[PDB]
Amino acid sequence: QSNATIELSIVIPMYNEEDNLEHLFARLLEVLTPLKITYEIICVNDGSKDKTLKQLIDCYQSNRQIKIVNLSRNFGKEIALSAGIDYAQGNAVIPIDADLQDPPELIHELVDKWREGYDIVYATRRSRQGETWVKQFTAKMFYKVIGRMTEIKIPPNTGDFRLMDRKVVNAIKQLPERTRFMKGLFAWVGYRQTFVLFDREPRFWNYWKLWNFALDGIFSFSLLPLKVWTYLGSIISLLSLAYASFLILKTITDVPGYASLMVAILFLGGVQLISLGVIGEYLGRVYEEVKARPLYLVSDLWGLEYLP
Amino acid sequence: QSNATIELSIVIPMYNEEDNLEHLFARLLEVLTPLKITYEIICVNDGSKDKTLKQLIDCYQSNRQIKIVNLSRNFGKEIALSAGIDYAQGNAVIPIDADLQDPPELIHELVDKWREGYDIVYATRRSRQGETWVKQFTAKMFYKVIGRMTEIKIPPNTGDFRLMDRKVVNAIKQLPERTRFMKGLFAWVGYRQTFVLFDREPRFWNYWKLWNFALDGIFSFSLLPLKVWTYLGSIISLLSLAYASFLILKTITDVPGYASLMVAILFLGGVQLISLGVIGEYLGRVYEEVKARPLYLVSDLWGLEYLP
Amino acid sequence: QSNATIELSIVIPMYNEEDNLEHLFARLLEVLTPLKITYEIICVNDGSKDKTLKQLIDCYQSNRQIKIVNLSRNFGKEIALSAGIDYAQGNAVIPIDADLQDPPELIHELVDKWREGYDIVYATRRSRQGETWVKQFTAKMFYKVIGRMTEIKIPPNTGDFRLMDRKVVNAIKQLPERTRFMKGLFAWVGYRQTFVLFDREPRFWNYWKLWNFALDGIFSFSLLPLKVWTYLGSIISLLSLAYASFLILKTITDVPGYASLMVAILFLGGVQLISLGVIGEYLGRVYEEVKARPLYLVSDLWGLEYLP
Amino acid sequence: QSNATIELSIVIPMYNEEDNLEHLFARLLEVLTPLKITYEIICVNDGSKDKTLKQLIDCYQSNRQIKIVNLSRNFGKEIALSAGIDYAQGNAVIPIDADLQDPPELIHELVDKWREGYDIVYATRRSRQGETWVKQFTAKMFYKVIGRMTEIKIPPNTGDFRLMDRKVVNAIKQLPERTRFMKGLFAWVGYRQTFVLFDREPRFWNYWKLWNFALDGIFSFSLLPLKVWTYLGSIISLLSLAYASFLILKTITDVPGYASLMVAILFLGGVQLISLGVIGEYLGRVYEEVKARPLYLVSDLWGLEYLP
Ligand SMILES: O=c1ccn([C@@H]2O[C@H](COP(=O)(O)OP(=O)(O)O[C@H]3O[C@H](CO)[C@@H](O)[C@H](O)[C@H]3O)[C@@H](O)[C@H]2O)c(=O)[nH]1
Ligand SMILES: O=c1ccn([C@@H]2O[C@H](COP(=O)(O)OP(=O)(O)O[C@H]3O[C@H](CO)[C@@H](O)[C@H](O)[C@H]3O)[C@@H](O)[C@H]2O)c(=O)[nH]1
Ligand SMILES: O=c1ccn([C@@H]2O[C@H](COP(=O)(O)OP(=O)(O)O[C@H]3O[C@H](CO)[C@@H](O)[C@H](O)[C@H]3O)[C@@H](O)[C@H]2O)c(=O)[nH]1
Ligand SMILES: O=c1ccn([C@@H]2O[C@H](COP(=O)(O)OP(=O)(O)O[C@H]3O[C@H](CO)[C@@H](O)[C@H](O)[C@H]3O)[C@@H](O)[C@H]2O)c(=O)[nH]1
Ligand SMILES: [Mg+2]
Ligand SMILES: [Mg+2]
Ligand SMILES: [Mg+2]
Ligand SMILES: [Mg+2]
């Protein structure tokens, strides 16, 4: 009997990953076979310029469980992962790196946690360890800032390695976004979520790129950087009128030219800052409208059918 | 004979509402039964972290009229209400609070008013009463400002407790919005509307949250905060040229350095304010386009079929 | 034999138009009957607060050719006209005012011009005449500005009275816009268009509203108000460096404090203006993208079928 | 046997092209016949005001392979090309100019390169030659700037003359854009692409229009002009506090009025520039979201079906 349904999906983005495919697939077949469930391996060749696609073709010819999504260009690891998740049909979707930095044997624990009733199972590293002190401090500050300014609780030490149930995968597909912060998106779609500790196996930064990623994470879920300027401009304006009133009082109790210039410069700056703050409020509203996030995400229903 | 049609829908958002469900449902069954019409109770469990969903399951197992929409996360009372209204199928939809702050026996008067021919029946409190003087003054000022700057007439003392006919519910579903001011939206979709006075039963503010809600209400229906800055910048620029011309006249009838600095600062500030005003005009246009409100909402038709 | 096709559609928006419906329909029946073609009258009751809808019901009960679209609220004359055009099914659509300011007997000339092969037939007044000199000057300046800054040639002295063929009506329905300048939209959708002169029959301004309408017309079809500021800021910056270099030359061939303040203020203003200009460019691009105008509008095809 | 499938499509935009249609079609029939494949000629009459459409009708009546798309207005060469590509159904689409500036006999080499396995075959001029030195320098600088600021590698000396496979045509149709930079779009959709050298046959600038085209190309694929201003404002602010601290140190080791004015002006300018930079970041995000580019473009698939 052919089940014709897939219980587990493994999404693996590739970029120049020859001489690693054999080890990858050997370890995965060693791990995914004792689970005794139907599975599929979605290898997303993300615009590699070397002999990576051909070995994927050779593997897929021999093995039915391997499926290949060949992106036209190099779109980036996150976009390749999103494409693989879009083309995955299993009940649970588990991203995996080609170099096998994250252990595959944690798939057993991920599946057990999922079967316990969780919809998201994060695979969080126990300790950063090999990361440099500068990287650790920057990551900690970034996560604290994300927690403070946003209403979203992104778990620490989380990578792409995780398990998403079919509900979460459908909800993520329900988010049309081009500037996506995947960590914040997964934490935004809040189902019953849990984490499993794992110690990265041994022997495993363009800070401009990390800064850009952090900027995307800040901007996609917080509008406060667009709201502060109204209050700052109002404060500066109020200080300007206070200074002008004090100068008038001094004149009656003449104003030097530099004092009048102070007053006018501060007032104009405050008015312009108020204008920028109002425009920033409207621009944040436009962003929230344009991102086209669903108003709500229903998890379970009693007595009703899921809306089209 | 099974009617297979629902005449009244009650949408109730929940958040940590145990030990209140029994009283809620007892009072509702006491009120909704003498109406002698088919009804349904849409309980929208809005991401409660305590034993609220389980009691809803127990109630729904015993009672067919109770339907549960379990949101994945805590999306907020307004979003839970919107989800319940989306999942309601009755001719009239009546939001209800779990704590029963608003009397359920007003549902009879709401239904009578609806049967009199109205499409929206507001349930307005006769007098704020227990509200503090600061809250009363802030609410009054907010409503006067809303009336002045917008073309929309939001009735005073209105909460979520109200009746929406199927026409109004469909029209509200026809408004794709993520930054929604529900009061302003309901007043924007203008059908035959009326109000019923009720005195809240006895024993029934994070001013930052109220300020944010007021800001959303101001920004979603008025663009004047984006239009003022053009006029302000033009006025400031005109004052700058007036001052410069007066200084030139004084020179011919030398200009001190502070006077030239005044002229240049004022002119640059006015030009920048004009630029900000033009950008604000275009941004307000972008907001109105992006909010994707329908051009018109047809209420009744003679001799024609409703367009797809 | 029932044709089951409508050859001409008359769209008439109404707002407090009692005691004029009888004269309206008498004149229309006097005009539309000698044409010997099937027609329909779409009366769009635009949220009138008096006894206008009831007389429309009485007329529609007696006459099959009268169809009523009753808007829920007062959306404005332009929006009511758009709704009536959306609900019209004739080959040619002719807007008409309720007070009969524009003669109905011009419908004969409009139909003749349409049958000559034109897709848009404007009904332009021969001379403004009764309009005040201020109104004439403002209208002329507005039309000259529209012609200069836009690539669109809006014919002068054009009102809502006109004929749109089914091709033009479909193309206009293909323009999803909430901030619509109907004159500019009709001139933007450029088919074979012509005009017919007519002298308004005898006995037939909130300048803030006219200013807002003009602002919408300017902003919906021109982006130059968002492009100028880059050039202005660059010019101001270049002047600032020129002044600073001249001051340095004077020092070597000390700079007074006011001169350094001039230099810094001008440079900062120019840099901020360049930033505003770049943001305005991107905002104009966002507007053009968001307005969702079709890339092209195909008029006639040979050897191919019209794309879905 | 009728193939009922088209192997090659030629898209030719027209604008006042009489007395050239006969030579055009003679040369094309001379070139496209030895290919021994089914073809079609899509002539997109782009709002010509002279006797161009009628000759196209006469040609299409005699020849079945000629198909005419008559645009309502003059939308521009790029938009007419896009419309023709939208209405083309061949496996390969080859844009062609009416004046035959680009040789038609290069279609043979384009087809050979396509049959070799490439999805895009650029037709690049070997040397600009007749172009003026100013034009050559401006084009070279523009292409270097495009390469530097964008991640996209637009090949040099490329015009509209090229071959797009059906995959690339479908991907381009998958890009809903109103402000389109076709060169950057084709380079953005990155398939297996190649180029063929050709020396333009003998006897074959409104710099404002070239500047606008360059501005569109810069703005549609780069957001850095919206990102720089945050860093510039932060630098200016830091300089302002440095100057203020140095002045305080000088006072303790009084500040002249011009020094305090320097400090305040620089600080306000830096704060406003930071606000403009944040707004520019959010506006670039809004642009990337609104342009509605697909997240990824899948080229080939193994073991899976193409998603709807
Ligand atoms: O453009 C692409 C397309 C696909 N992948 C795939 O993504 C997987 C893992 O990528 P990798 O770069 O090895 O991530 P990590 O091993 O977790 O470590 C990274 O840690 C930093 C940020 O996580 C990166 O800047 C470093 O390049 C990299 O060492 C692999 O299967 C790759 O093939 C990329 O990395 N980049
Ligand atoms: O995140 C959520 C999800 C659902 N609900 C439901 O909303 C209903 C009523 O909410 P409630 O907070 O009790 O509103 P009120 O009783 O009308 O009074 C409110 O008045 C203020 C603004 O109306 C709020 O800030 C106060 O928290 C609250 O006392 C209840 O069924 C709740 O379960 C919430 O309130 N918050
Ligand atoms: O909100 C609405 C809804 C519908 N209509 C209909 O529009 C038609 C004609 O409107 P009308 O105001 O009479 O336009 P005009 O007769 O052409 O003259 C106008 O000229 C100015 C701008 O055209 C307006 O400001 C003046 O109110 C008005 O006299 C009539 O059938 C009205 O019923 C409105 O005018 N306003
Ligand atoms: O509005 C339109 C509609 C269609 N076409 C068609 O486009 C084709 C080629 O256009 P053309 O202007 O001749 O381009 P080139 O021959 O490559 O040279 C151009 O080089 C510059 C930019 O490429 C232009 O500014 C010059 O007008 C023009 O000489 C022809 O079939 C035209 O009919 C236009 O050019 N403009
Ligand atoms: Mg790695
Ligand atoms: Mg309460
Ligand atoms: Mg009138
Ligand atoms: Mg040419």
Side-chain angles (χ1 to χ4, degrees):
Chain A
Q1 177 256 348
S2 196
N3 295 91
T5 182
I6 305 99
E7 198 82 5
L8 180 54
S9 279
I10 308 296
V11 175
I12 316 173
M14 311 315 208
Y15 189 129
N16 299 331
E17 306 293 355
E18 41 284 51
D19 317 326
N20 274 17
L21 299 195
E22 48 195 310
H23 184 74
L24 197 44
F25 294 141
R27 284 271 284 285
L28 279 179
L29 270 275
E30 162 105 354
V31 172
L32 295 172
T33 303
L35 277 182
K36 319 188 102 173
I37 46 164
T38 326
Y39 71 85
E40 56 159 47
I41 296 145
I42 304 266
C43 309
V44 195
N45 177 43
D46 182 343
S48 45
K49 321 281 206 324
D50 320 328
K51 326 181 310 318
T52 89
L53 186 54
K54 332 304 298 187
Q55 320 194 359
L56 278 184
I57 310 204
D58 283 329
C59 291
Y60 146 82
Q61 290 286 333
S62 86
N63 160 280
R64 190 82 54 157
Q65 277 78 54
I66 280 170
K67 325 172 137 184
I68 299 153
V69 180
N70 188 51
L71 292 191
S72 65
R73 212 215 319 130
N74 162 77
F75 286 92
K77 166 211 159 115
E78 169 208 320
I79 292 195
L81 261 184
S82 176
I85 290 154
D86 274 36
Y87 272 97
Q89 268 154 319
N91 284 321
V93 180
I94 300 191
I96 279 284
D97 313 337
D99 39 12
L100 222 60
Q101 183 188 244
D102 36 8
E105 308 84 342
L106 209 74
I107 277 170
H108 283 167
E109 292 265 40
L110 293 183
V111 163
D112 287 27
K113 263 306 173 311
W114 165 47
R115 295 215 231 261
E116 252 205 77
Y118 297 98
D119 307 305
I120 287 284
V121 193
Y122 299 103
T124 70
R125 308 109 83 190
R126 194 176 327 272
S127 112
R128 280 182 174 289
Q129 204 74 343
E131 314 275 303
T132 319
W133 178 93
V134 172
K135 223 274 167 200
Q136 297 185 84
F137 204 90
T138 51
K140 282 186 38 59
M141 290 306 110
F142 164 72
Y143 284 129
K144 302 211 64 47
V145 161
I146 288 284
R148 254 67 161 175
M149 321 195 318
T150 72
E151 328 281 310
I152 282 306
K153 53 204 71 53
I154 306 183
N157 301 332
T158 64
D160 61 5
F161 194 24
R162 84 174 29 106
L163 183 142
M164 313 158 258
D165 197 69
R166 186 94 243 140
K167 331 170 71 161
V168 181
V169 174
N170 286 354
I172 292 288
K173 283 153 100 163
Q174 261 203 309
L175 307 158
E177 281 186 20
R178 308 315 192 278
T179 89
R180 325 162 61 72
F181 186 60
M182 281 296 248
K183 278 140 165 302
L185 265 196
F186 293 140
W188 186 93
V189 171
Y191 284 89
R192 205 175 144 64
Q193 73 186 7
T194 203
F195 70 101
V196 47
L197 294 200
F198 78 100
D199 305 84
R200 210 104 103 320
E201 95 274 305
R203 1 122 289 114
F204 251 146
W205 311 263
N206 185 351
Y207 278 74
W208 174 273
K209 293 303 211 303
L210 294 62
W211 177 249
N212 283 43
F213 200 54
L215 283 197
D216 168 56
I218 304 285
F219 293 163
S220 304
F221 311 79
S222 180
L223 301 179
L224 162 73
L226 290 177
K227 323 266 194 92
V228 288
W229 310 113
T230 315
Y231 324 120
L232 281 63
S234 47
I235 288 153
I236 288 149
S237 298
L238 287 173
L239 292 178
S240 61
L241 302 307
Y243 191 42
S245 305
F246 149 81
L247 290 161
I248 295 190
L249 261 293
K250 199 82 157 155
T251 53
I252 52 101
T253 322
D254 210 343
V255 153
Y258 80 86
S260 151
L261 267 79
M262 201 36 68
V263 166
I265 285 152
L266 259 206
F267 170 71
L268 264 281
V271 152
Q272 292 194 57
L273 268 192
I274 276 176
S275 181
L276 268 300
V278 170
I279 277 185
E281 296 256 9
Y282 272 89
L283 182 62
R285 299 283 145 74
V286 167
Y287 203 25
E288 201 53 29
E289 265 312 325
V290 161
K291 263 152 51 203
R293 267 166 193 165
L295 209 63
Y296 58 94
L297 290 158
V298 58
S299 89
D300 304 68
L301 265 153
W302 288 253
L304 297 145
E305 294 189 351
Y306 280 84
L307 287 184
Chain B
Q1 177 256 348
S2 196
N3 295 91
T5 182
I6 305 100
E7 198 82 5
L8 180 54
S9 279
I10 308 296
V11 175
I12 316 173
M14 311 315 208
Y15 189 129
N16 299 331
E17 306 293 355
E18 41 284 51
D19 317 326
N20 274 17
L21 299 195
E22 48 195 310
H23 184 74
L24 197 44
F25 294 141
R27 284 271 284 285
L28 279 179
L29 270 275
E30 162 105 354
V31 172
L32 295 172
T33 303
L35 277 182
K36 319 188 102 173
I37 46 164
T38 326
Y39 71 85
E40 56 159 47
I41 296 145
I42 304 266
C43 309
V44 195
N45 177 43
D46 182 344
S48 45
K49 321 281 206 324
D50 321 328
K51 326 181 310 318
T52 89
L53 186 55
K54 332 304 298 187
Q55 320 194 359
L56 278 184
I57 310 204
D58 283 329
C59 291
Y60 146 82
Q61 290 286 333
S62 86
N63 160 280
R64 190 82 54 157
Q65 277 78 54
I66 280 170
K67 325 172 137 184
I68 299 153
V69 180
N70 188 51
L71 292 191
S72 65
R73 212 215 319 130
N74 162 77
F75 286 92
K77 166 211 158 115
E78 169 208 320
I79 292 195
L81 261 184
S82 176
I85 290 154
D86 274 36
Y87 272 97
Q89 268 154 319
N91 284 321
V93 180
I94 300 191
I96 279 284
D97 313 337
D99 39 12
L100 222 60
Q101 183 188 244
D102 36 8
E105 308 84 342
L106 209 74
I107 277 170
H108 283 167
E109 292 265 40
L110 293 183
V111 163
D112 287 27
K113 263 306 173 311
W114 165 47
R115 295 214 231 261
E116 252 205 77
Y118 297 98
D119 307 305
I120 287 284
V121 193
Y122 299 103
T124 70
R125 308 109 83 190
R126 194 176 327 272
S127 112
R128 280 182 174 289
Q129 204 74 343
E131 314 275 303
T132 319
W133 178 93
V134 172
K135 223 274 167 200
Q136 297 185 84
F137 204 90
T138 51
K140 282 186 38 59
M141 290 306 110
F142 164 72
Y143 284 129
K144 302 211 64 47
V145 161
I146 288 284
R148 254 67 161 175
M149 321 195 318
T150 72
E151 328 281 310
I152 282 306
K153 53 204 71 53
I154 306 183
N157 300 332
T158 64
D160 61 5
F161 194 24
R162 84 174 29 105
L163 183 142
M164 313 158 258
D165 197 69
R166 185 94 243 140
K167 331 170 71 161
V168 181
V169 174
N170 286 354
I172 292 288
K173 283 153 100 163
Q174 261 203 309
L175 307 158
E177 281 186 20
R178 308 315 192 278
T179 89
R180 325 162 60 72
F181 186 60
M182 281 296 248
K183 278 140 165 302
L185 265 196
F186 293 140
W188 186 93
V189 171
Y191 284 89
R192 205 175 144 64
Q193 73 186 7
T194 203
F195 70 101
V196 47
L197 294 200
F198 78 100
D199 305 84
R200 210 104 104 320
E201 95 273 305
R203 1 122 289 114
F204 251 146
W205 311 263
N206 185 351
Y207 278 74
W208 174 273
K209 293 303 211 303
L210 294 62
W211 177 248
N212 283 43
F213 200 54
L215 283 197
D216 168 56
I218 304 285
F219 293 163
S220 304
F221 311 79
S222 180
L223 301 179
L224 162 73
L226 290 177
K227 323 266 194 92
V228 289
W229 310 113
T230 315
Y231 324 120
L232 281 63
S234 47
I235 288 153
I236 288 149
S237 298
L238 287 173
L239 292 178
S240 61
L241 303 307
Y243 191 42
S245 305
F246 149 81
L247 291 161
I248 295 190
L249 261 293
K250 199 82 157 155
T251 53
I252 52 101
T253 322
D254 210 343
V255 153
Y258 80 86
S260 151
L261 267 79
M262 201 36 68
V263 166
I265 285 152
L266 259 206
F267 170 71
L268 264 281
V271 153
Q272 292 194 57
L273 268 192
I274 276 176
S275 181
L276 268 300
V278 170
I279 277 185
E281 296 256 9
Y282 272 89
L283 182 62
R285 299 283 145 74
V286 168
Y287 203 25
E288 201 53 29
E289 265 312 325
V290 161
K291 263 152 51 203
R293 267 166 193 165
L295 209 63
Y296 58 94
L297 290 158
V298 58
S299 89
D300 304 68
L301 265 153
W302 288 253
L304 297 145
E305 294 189 351
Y306 280 84
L307 287 184
Chain C
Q1 177 256 348
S2 196
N3 295 91
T5 182
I6 305 100
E7 198 82 5
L8 180 54
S9 279
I10 308 296
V11 175
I12 316 173
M14 311 315 208
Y15 189 129
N16 299 331
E17 306 293 355
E18 41 284 51
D19 317 326
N20 274 17
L21 299 195
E22 48 195 310
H23 184 74
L24 197 44
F25 294 141
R27 284 271 284 285
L28 279 179
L29 270 275
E30 162 105 354
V31 172
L32 295 172
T33 303
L35 277 182
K36 319 188 102 173
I37 46 164
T38 326
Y39 71 85
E40 56 159 47
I41 296 145
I42 304 266
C43 309
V44 195
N45 177 43
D46 182 344
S48 45
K49 321 282 206 324
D50 321 328
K51 326 181 310 318
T52 89
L53 186 55
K54 332 304 298 187
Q55 320 194 359
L56 278 184
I57 310 204
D58 283 329
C59 291
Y60 146 82
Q61 290 286 333
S62 86
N63 160 280
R64 190 82 54 157
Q65 277 78 54
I66 280 170
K67 325 172 137 184
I68 299 153
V69 180
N70 188 51
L71 292 191
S72 65
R73 212 215 319 130
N74 162 77
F75 286 92
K77 166 211 158 115
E78 169 208 320
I79 292 195
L81 261 184
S82 176
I85 290 154
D86 274 36
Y87 272 97
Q89 268 154 319
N91 284 321
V93 180
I94 300 191
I96 279 284
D97 313 337
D99 39 12
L100 222 60
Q101 183 188 244
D102 36 8
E105 308 84 342
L106 209 74
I107 277 170
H108 283 167
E109 292 265 40
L110 293 183
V111 163
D112 287 27
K113 263 306 173 311
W114 165 47
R115 295 214 231 261
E116 251 205 77
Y118 297 98
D119 307 305
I120 287 284
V121 193
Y122 299 103
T124 70
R125 308 110 83 190
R126 194 176 327 272
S127 112
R128 280 182 174 289
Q129 204 74 343
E131 314 275 303
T132 319
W133 178 93
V134 172
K135 223 274 167 200
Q136 297 185 84
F137 204 90
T138 51
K140 282 186 38 59
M141 290 306 110
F142 164 72
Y143 284 129
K144 303 211 64 47
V145 161
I146 288 284
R148 254 67 161 175
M149 321 195 318
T150 72
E151 328 281 310
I152 282 306
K153 53 204 71 53
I154 306 183
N157 300 332
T158 64
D160 61 5
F161 194 24
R162 84 174 29 105
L163 183 142
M164 313 158 258
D165 197 69
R166 185 94 243 140
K167 331 170 71 161
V168 181
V169 174
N170 286 354
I172 292 288
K173 283 153 100 163
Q174 261 203 309
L175 307 158
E177 281 186 20
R178 308 315 192 278
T179 89
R180 325 162 61 72
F181 186 60
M182 281 296 248
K183 278 140 165 302
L185 265 196
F186 293 140
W188 186 93
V189 171
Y191 284 89
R192 205 175 144 64
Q193 73 186 7
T194 203
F195 70 101
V196 47
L197 294 200
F198 78 100
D199 305 84
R200 210 104 103 320
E201 95 274 305
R203 1 122 289 114
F204 251 146
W205 311 263
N206 185 351
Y207 278 74
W208 174 273
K209 293 303 211 303
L210 294 62
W211 177 249
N212 283 43
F213 200 54
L215 283 197
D216 168 56
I218 304 285
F219 293 163
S220 304
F221 311 79
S222 180
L223 301 179
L224 162 73
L226 290 177
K227 323 266 194 92
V228 288
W229 310 113
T230 315
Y231 324 120
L232 281 63
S234 47
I235 288 153
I236 288 149
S237 298
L238 287 173
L239 292 178
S240 61
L241 303 307
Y243 191 42
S245 305
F246 149 81
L247 290 161
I248 295 190
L249 261 293
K250 199 82 157 155
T251 53
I252 52 101
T253 322
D254 210 343
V255 153
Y258 80 86
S260 151
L261 267 79
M262 201 36 68
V263 166
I265 285 152
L266 259 206
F267 170 71
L268 264 281
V271 152
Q272 292 194 57
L273 268 192
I274 276 176
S275 181
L276 268 300
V278 170
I279 277 185
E281 296 256 9
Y282 272 89
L283 182 62
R285 299 283 145 74
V286 168
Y287 203 25
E288 201 53 29
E289 265 312 325
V290 161
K291 263 152 51 203
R293 267 166 193 165
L295 209 63
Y296 58 94
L297 290 158
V298 58
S299 89
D300 304 68
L301 265 152
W302 288 253
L304 297 145
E305 294 189 351
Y306 280 84
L307 287 184
Chain D
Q1 177 256 348
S2 196
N3 295 91
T5 182
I6 305 100
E7 198 82 5
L8 180 54
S9 279
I10 308 296
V11 175
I12 316 173
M14 311 315 208
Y15 189 129
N16 299 331
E17 306 293 355
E18 41 284 51
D19 317 326
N20 274 17
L21 298 195
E22 48 195 310
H23 184 74
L24 197 44
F25 294 141
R27 284 271 284 285
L28 279 179
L29 270 275
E30 162 105 354
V31 172
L32 295 172
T33 303
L35 277 182
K36 319 188 102 173
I37 46 164
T38 326
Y39 71 85
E40 56 159 47
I41 296 145
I42 304 266
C43 309
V44 195
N45 177 43
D46 182 344
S48 45
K49 321 282 206 324
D50 320 328
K51 326 181 310 318
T52 89
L53 186 54
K54 332 304 298 187
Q55 320 194 359
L56 278 184
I57 310 204
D58 283 329
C59 291
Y60 146 82
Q61 290 286 333
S62 86
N63 160 280
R64 190 82 54 157
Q65 277 78 54
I66 280 170
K67 325 172 137 184
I68 299 153
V69 180
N70 188 51
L71 292 191
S72 65
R73 212 215 319 130
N74 162 77
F75 286 92
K77 166 211 158 115
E78 169 208 320
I79 292 195
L81 261 184
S82 176
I85 290 154
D86 274 36
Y87 271 97
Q89 268 154 319
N91 284 321
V93 180
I94 300 191
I96 279 284
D97 313 337
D99 39 12
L100 222 60
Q101 183 188 244
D102 36 8
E105 308 84 342
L106 209 74
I107 277 170
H108 283 167
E109 292 265 40
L110 293 183
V111 163
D112 287 27
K113 263 306 173 311
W114 165 47
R115 295 214 231 261
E116 251 205 77
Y118 297 98
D119 307 305
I120 287 284
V121 193
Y122 299 103
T124 70
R125 308 110 83 190
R126 194 176 327 272
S127 112
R128 279 182 174 289
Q129 204 74 343
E131 314 275 303
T132 319
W133 178 93
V134 172
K135 223 274 167 200
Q136 296 185 84
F137 204 90
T138 51
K140 282 186 38 59
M141 290 306 110
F142 164 72
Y143 284 129
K144 302 211 64 47
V145 161
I146 288 284
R148 254 67 161 175
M149 321 195 318
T150 72
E151 328 281 310
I152 282 306
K153 53 204 71 53
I154 306 183
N157 301 332
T158 64
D160 61 5
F161 194 24
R162 84 174 29 105
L163 183 142
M164 313 158 258
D165 197 69
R166 186 94 243 140
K167 331 170 71 161
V168 181
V169 174
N170 286 354
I172 292 288
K173 283 153 100 163
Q174 261 203 309
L175 307 158
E177 281 186 20
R178 308 315 192 278
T179 89
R180 325 162 60 72
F181 186 60
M182 281 296 248
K183 278 140 165 302
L185 265 196
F186 293 140
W188 186 93
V189 171
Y191 284 89
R192 205 175 144 64
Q193 73 186 7
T194 203
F195 70 101
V196 47
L197 294 200
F198 78 100
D199 305 83
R200 210 104 103 320
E201 95 274 305
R203 1 122 289 114
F204 251 146
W205 310 263
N206 185 351
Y207 278 74
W208 174 273
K209 293 303 211 303
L210 294 62
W211 177 249
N212 283 43
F213 200 54
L215 283 197
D216 168 56
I218 304 285
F219 293 163
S220 304
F221 311 79
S222 180
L223 301 179
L224 162 73
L226 290 177
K227 323 266 194 92
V228 288
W229 310 113
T230 315
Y231 324 120
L232 281 63
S234 47
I235 288 153
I236 288 149
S237 298
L238 287 173
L239 292 178
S240 61
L241 303 307
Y243 191 42
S245 305
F246 149 81
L247 290 161
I248 295 190
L249 261 293
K250 199 82 157 155
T251 53
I252 52 101
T253 322
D254 210 343
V255 153
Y258 80 86
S260 151
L261 267 79
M262 201 35 68
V263 166
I265 285 152
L266 259 206
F267 170 71
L268 264 281
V271 152
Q272 292 194 57
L273 268 192
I274 276 176
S275 181
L276 268 300
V278 170
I279 277 185
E281 296 256 9
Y282 272 89
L283 182 62
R285 299 283 145 74
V286 167
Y287 203 25
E288 201 53 29
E289 265 312 325
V290 161
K291 263 152 51 203
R293 267 166 193 165
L295 209 63
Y296 58 94
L297 290 158
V298 58
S299 89
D300 304 68
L301 265 152
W302 288 253
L304 297 145
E305 294 189 351
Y306 280 84
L307 287 184

